[PDB]
Amino acid sequence: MEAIAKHDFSATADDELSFRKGQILKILNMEDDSNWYRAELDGKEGLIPSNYIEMKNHD
């Protein structure tokens, strides 16, 4: 699916992804279903926190 950054996030270990409020993060990982997920932004993929991605558009 698609998501949006509610707050700012700066990566610590491995390959995490940084983001800021108002930003649009893409959800395209697998079926882990947990706290770490894989996203895509500006043609780049990575891992982000599920609680750090909100929802927008649609409605």
UniProtKB/Swiss-Prot annotation:
Residues 1-58 form the SH3 domain. Found mainly in the developing eye and in the antennal disk. Also observed in other imaginal disks tested and in the embryo. Expressed in Johnston's organ, the hearing organ, neurons (at protein level). Disruption phenotype: Embryonically lethal. Loss in Johnston's organ causes scolopidium abnormalities. Changing residue 49 to L: Inactivates the SH3 domain. Abolishes binding to Dab. It is found in: Membrane; Synapse. Belongs to the GRB2/sem-5/DRK family. Interacts with autophosphorylated sev via SH2 domain and Sos, Dos and Dab via SH3 domains. Binds to tyrosine phosphorylated Dab via the SH2 domain. Interacts with phosphorylated Ack. This is Growth factor receptor-bound protein 2. The lineage of its organism: Eukaryota, Metazoa, Ecdysozoa, Arthropoda, Hexapoda.
